[PDB]
Amino acid sequence: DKELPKKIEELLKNVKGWRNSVAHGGRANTSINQKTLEENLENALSMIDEILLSMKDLKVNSKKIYLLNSTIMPIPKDNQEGKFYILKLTKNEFKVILENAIKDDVLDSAIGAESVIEFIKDKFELTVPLKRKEIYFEKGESALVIKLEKRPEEGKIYTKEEMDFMEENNLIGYYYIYREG
Amino acid sequence: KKILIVSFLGKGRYYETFYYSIEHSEKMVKKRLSPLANAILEKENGNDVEIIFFVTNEVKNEFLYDENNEYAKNILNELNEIKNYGIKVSYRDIPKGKNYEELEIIMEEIEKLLLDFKGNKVIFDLTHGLRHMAIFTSSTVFYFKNLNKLEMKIVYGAYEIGVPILDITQTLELSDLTIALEEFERYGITERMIIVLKNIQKIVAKNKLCNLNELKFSSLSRELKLFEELLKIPSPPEKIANSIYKINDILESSIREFKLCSLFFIKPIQKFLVDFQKIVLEKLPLDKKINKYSNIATLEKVEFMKNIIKLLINWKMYSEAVIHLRELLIDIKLIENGKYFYYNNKDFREKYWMYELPKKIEELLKNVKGWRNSVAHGGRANTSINQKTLEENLENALSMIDEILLSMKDLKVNSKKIYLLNSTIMPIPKDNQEGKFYILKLTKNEFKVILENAIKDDVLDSAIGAESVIEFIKDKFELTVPLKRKEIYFEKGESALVIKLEKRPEEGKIYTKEEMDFMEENNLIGYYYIYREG
Amino acid sequence: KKILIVSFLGKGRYYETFYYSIEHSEKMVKKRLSPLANAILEKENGNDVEIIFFVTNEVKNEFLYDENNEYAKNILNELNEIKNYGIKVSYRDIPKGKNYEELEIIMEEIEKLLLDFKGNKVIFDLTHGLRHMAIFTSSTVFYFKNLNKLEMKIVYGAYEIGVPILDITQTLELSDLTIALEEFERYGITERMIIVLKNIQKIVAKNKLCNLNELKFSSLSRELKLFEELLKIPSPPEKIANSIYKINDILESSIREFKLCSLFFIKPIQKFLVDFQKIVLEKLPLDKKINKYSNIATLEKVEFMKNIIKLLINWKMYSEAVIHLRELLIDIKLIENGKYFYYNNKDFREKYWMYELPKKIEELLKNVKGWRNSVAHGGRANTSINQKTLEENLENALSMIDEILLSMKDLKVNSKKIYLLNSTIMPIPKDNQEGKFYILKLTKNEFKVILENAIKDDVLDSAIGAESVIEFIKDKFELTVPLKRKEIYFEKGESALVIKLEKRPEEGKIYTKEEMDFMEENNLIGYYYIYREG
RNA sequence: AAAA
RNA sequence: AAAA
């Protein structure tokens, strides 16, 4: 919509063209010479500087991000099928997304165990609501997820003291879930 | 309340008689003719009554001039008195009906009358006149009734039951119902028949002979209309199966209710009900409960749809047959490649609209696709297909669907690992960093079918981790499933059946199998299929 | 040659009479009843003849026991003698036809008879019996004729024309033709009507009343069948226009030929011919010669196709209407973007199936495309569309096609440079090193239309280099075109009309305009459209 | 991992 | 460049 995405899209259009010039050997009359390319690279770098300014303030409006403690794929009772995408994140990636969700005011926590509240509050110095509710993924919604990379006995809940050791050996997993359909 | 009466004229001994209309026998009229007692009885209901007589000129002169015709002078004098309390009577001349041309002149007279009338009802009192004339006119009404629909009644004054003038509208009814029966029987048109069905219902409702709500004539007619609309307009096989199953159940109840009800002629309405019996339902794989497999491709669903293709052809609906044939072949590709769970997924369907036995299947797709495009693109850009070629191709394709469907009930599409899980999770290998998953809601029947087949193919990888879920599956489905509360990981292309609680209990709570049964009663137990596409 | 006769029984004075069948009046039989003279005349043709009488039990006893019934004993004695040279006669009992139930018992009797017969013909001698019975049976035949089709004849022994027994098969004919007329009139079905058309032709051919080859009934029926097949099966608008134009010409010749031909009942066959008059042809833009614009998209062709969409809807053919509506909107996009020359090019058509007034046009495409897919994909993957929504959408789209078609007859799609060339060459700029060209064969009418419009839009760039070609164009098309024997070069997107010799003369030869006329007579002059796409 |  |  706004002026900024138009700026970004145009700069791709042009970068694309002259990358293709490099990337197909200029065949079929699409050549670029060294000096024009070097000029274009510099012009383009100026505008990247400009774009990176405009974006460094942009309240990039993250929509609802649910917070889950399982990599489940609930869809509305409304829906009969779904397509989901899951990505493994690092503890840093997890912290970054979570922090931003909290600051943008877009986090929908469904963390149903206080021991996870304990864990998040300690390991990330972020306080997250405890809410044992169903959520359902509407198309285009996202979830941060934190799960045990182990399936214990039933009913077992780990003390935060044990979870520290779990976190020690990469036995606590962070995930991003996106519903594409 | 404005009525026109038509009758021929005769040359017999026209007696003076007692005439009463059957539907109200307390009223009688002394006249020497049928139309005259008719017209007097009708003006007896505050109606406007006029008459017209078709008099062969031979009757005009031989009879109605000879004052040496005792009864003829009788009749003419009564005619003159018919001016009475106001009744118009007048005559057109007609030929003997000797040959083709004469019967046609009689028809043109009937036409002239019909058009020129500015009233409500026309009564065809075929009583008098050379009957030879009367037989033609009865059919003549049928023709002209369906080719301005005002109102008919055809009557006959029987002398030797005295003498009541009898409704004989039924004679044109049965030819009306002949149009209805044929139009449906050859073309599946329900328009005509819905009149009779709502017709008979209102009468039994107005007279408590049969028991509506056991006839369910309202349901039967509404379902007939929708089933025709689902045939004419290519529609999901799920809707077709739904209506066909509703119509089986409705049909059985109304069949029970008929019972020679104590006026609602019974035999024709039964002749048609059997046509659906024979034309529609009796060629359909109903013992499989197609209604219960709404979400996946199955070989029985392919069978149901194959016969629906056959019926579409029987009713001159060839182009809907081609459309359905192509979608059916995508259903077969789905099944034969183990993608049956993608049934109602638009993307996969077009991805397989592009992407010995499999070779046979794919050649048949290529060719069916071609013919579908000929139809679905108006034959544009010189891709037309004509009817005879299309029906030829349709029959060959159906024959080969049978060949394939046999050779396929043998091919055990050897399902690889199907995990059985008790939650809708997407675990991937620690090797992996991302994954793309597809989740589909399953019916209890679909779930049981997938599971049953997985066990018999010996490809089930149970990771069911609660003993009560083992409990519940074994009872509710009579299938035995290992308790193995382990991690699993989806490789690309692996699939899981899932059995889950559709509610979030307190932490740690495990429901007992009795409780799972209770949840399942009010639909808090959910079945799913999960597939990793990437 | 094996025949079953059916008649009721009466209680009047059954006289001894002279009976002759009309179609052979040299033979007569002295009997007191109609079926008896009938049966004797029939065994007079080396046939197997049997009889059956429907005798109300009241007739059984009141009449045929009283030996104090002078004529009744007459009749029974003649019955006994009917054993004669071999004629079986036997009776079933019937009720009075007092009410619904009784008429139905009479029907069931008729049914029993019909099924149990193992012969060829059944003659319904409705002469005797309470006529009230006879009126019902005539219709009863219609019903049962269309619901085992063996053979009918219905006859009437008229006393007071002596006495000839008269074929009255026509009474069931006209109700037969009522099924034919309705089925076509509401549904465009030609099955029924083709019987009558071939029927009447064979009779006039067998009796030289009308002049076939001016009736062309063979052509009319064959064209009727193909036109129905082109309606039911979505077909190129070129075939639809072709058949409609052939059927106009055929219809005018057969209409002329009818002439009250000196047995081939005339009025119904005329009623139907007018239905096509009114239903089909009279709502069609025929003054434009659509047949002559077979290769390009035109606004008049869009008009013809819009009305064909309307007719498709009138005959409950909604799904063909959706298909044709989408292709029609691609035709409109083609025209409005000046790509009309791509009409029958499959690639361009799908490239525009993807790629204020234009905004209106594109929104209407989006929506029409959606509904087409609902139909052409079986509503699969939950994309179904129902009949009521579809017809609602069809009417809205037709209304907006009218809006657009008006607002478009104003929009001069401002053709840029159209070269006029006299050879099918592909010259490109010296700037350019490659080019991609599209060449399309044009009709003399298409060529003249493109040229005419180019001149009036003032966008023609003539490079016609022979004075005689200027000569020929001006005469043959009454259009004036500059002589400018220059190089031109196609830029991307430029177009040329071309007028060319379809023969390679000796070198250097220029044909004079007289010679060009001579070539054009035997089709050695070719018209083309050339477009540079790249 | 019937929502670590 | 009505097939330089």
Helices and strands, with pairings:
This is part of a larger assembly, with three copies of chain A.
Chain A: H1 3-23, H2 34-57, E1 65-68, E2 81-89, H3 91-103, E3 107-109, H4 114-124, E4 142-148, H5 160-168, E5 172-179
Parallel strand pairs in A: 1-3, 1-4
Antiparallel strand pairs in A: 2-5, 4-5
Chain A binds two RNA strands through residues 68-72, 74, 110-113, 115-116, 119, 132-135, 145-152, 154, 157-158, 163, 172-173.
The helix-strand sequence of chain A is HHEEHEHEHE
Largest interface: B-C, 88 and 88 residues
Tally the helices of chain A: what do you get? 5
Main structural class of chain A:
alpha/beta
Biggest sheet of chain A, open or closed, and with what strands and sense? 5 strands, mixed
Cα distance spanning the termini of chain A? 23 Å
Disulfide bonds (chains B, C): 210-261
Structural account:
- This is part of a larger assembly, with 3 copies of chain A.
- With 181 residues, chain A is an alpha/beta fold.
- Chain A contains 5 helices and 5 strands, in the order ααββαβαβαβ.
- Chain A has helices spanning 3-23, 34-57, 91-103, 114-124, 160-168, and strands at residues 65-68, 81-89, 107-109, 142-148, 172-179.
- In chain A, strands 2-5-4-1-3 form a 5-stranded mixed beta sheet.
- In chain A, helix 1 (3-23) packs antiparallel against helix 2 (34-57).
- The radius of gyration of chain A is 22 Å and the shape is elongated.
- Chains in contact: A-B, B-C.
- At the B-C interface, helix 4, helix 5, helix 6, helix 10 and helix 12 of B face helix 4, helix 5, helix 6, helix 10 and helix 12 of C.
- The structure holds 2 RNA strands.
